[PDB]
Ligand binder design. Sequence first.
Ligand SMILES: O=C(O)COc1cc(Cl)c(Cl)cc1Cl
Ligand SMILES: O=C(O)COc1cc(Cl)c(Cl)cc1Cl
Lengths: 115, 116, 115, 115
Amino acid sequence: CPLMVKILDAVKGTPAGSVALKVSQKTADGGWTQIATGVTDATGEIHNLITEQQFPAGVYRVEFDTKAYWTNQGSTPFHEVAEVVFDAHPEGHRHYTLALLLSPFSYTTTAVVSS
Amino acid sequence: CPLMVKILDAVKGTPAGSVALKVSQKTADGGWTQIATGVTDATGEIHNLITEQQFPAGVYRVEFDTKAYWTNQGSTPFHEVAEVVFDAHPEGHRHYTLALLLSPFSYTTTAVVSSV
Amino acid sequence: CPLMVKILDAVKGTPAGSVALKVSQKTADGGWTQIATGVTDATGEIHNLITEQQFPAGVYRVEFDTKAYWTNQGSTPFHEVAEVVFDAHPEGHRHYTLALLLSPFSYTTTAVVSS
Amino acid sequence: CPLMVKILDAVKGTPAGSVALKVSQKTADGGWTQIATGVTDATGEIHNLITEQQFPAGVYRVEFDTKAYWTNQGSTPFHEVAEVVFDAHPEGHRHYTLALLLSPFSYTTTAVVSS
Ligand SMILES: O=C(O)COc1cc(Cl)c(Cl)cc1Cl
Ligand SMILES: O=C(O)COc1cc(Cl)c(Cl)cc1Cl
């Protein structure tokens, strides 16, 4: 699992379960192509989101469907989506964790990149 | 102005000056049309970014070039960009402020939406 | 106005009005002396909280009553209080703004220090 | 473990290692009694910070020595400490994880509470 997520709900104080996301890779011409989808489990994580073979060096975009998450919680959200875009260098089994803390009108995102 | 930003630097405890951004408006086909560009002043703001006339209801995208900000600050950043995407309902002189708090490997974004 | 606050509500997307706060100064013996109290207005701010004369160099605590903010909203919060503790060096008309972004189970706090 | 911490460093994108902290319980007279100290490991966690025997219902403070962390990282920090203050087990026993995201002039705290 070279690419992990950890999503927390700042209203309830729990992980954010059943958050849908989409992973895209930047193409040589400057656009995007979607390579994977996932939904968080009750711990706010997605196991086996993509394989190492699917995660070579390059720029990736992870789109988190925060609007649906909040709608399904019965809240009104501000953001249409939460996007995280980063250049990955998985050389040497370098692993990436995208952390996301959700509120209806706010999110915080950070990354933990292993050695 | 109907669309304001406020960018702060969490490493230095100052506003984030000279951050470039782009504002786009979603098209019925799901494309994006760029409608404005700008650069924050030393208070982390952009005054008169767009007019009310230019800000009808619809989905908007604001793309903050945080990578150049951090590279110029001498830090290596994680994110290639920071994008904020939201549906706007400007009816009644409802105004939007996008607040962004930057660190090299993290950002917090929130919105303040005024009453009619 | 050497000491300013700005409090936002991450659930509703508004300033956090009517938040009570207390300002304390650390004493030589390791204790705290309360020097000011205040309540945020509808913009999430407090004007004329303390004067420059009252704000000599030293360590200060600002205690925000976030629990009552959420409880009076009908929400259920985690934190008893939010405290911000910092060493101030106000020489040269150096001003401090404490920014606070509130959710029921989270808060983000940052500082803007002028030149 | 009824009380866990997870500390991340938003400058480097790593867990925050070797962060010292102190856990205190509020006393009926308004004082604080220290019940434990600890130091995070390289994963930004402290295993077995307190035991169940040390964790009756009541108000607790976790004081994180963030200033020493940044000083050793070679940065100039704003805050003296980061304090997290919460009522434990208000409606019955729970387990608590205190997440803390550190920058030199800012931090984000949230909590994950489970049954
Ligand atoms: O559980 C963790 O990954 C540690 O706690 C956090 C979680 C999130 Cl989602 C964020 Cl943005 C920060 C921290 Cl410290
Ligand atoms: O909103 C302000 O003007 C000052 O305080 C903040 C600044 C930022 Cl960038 C964020 Cl994300 C939150 C707050 Cl409270």
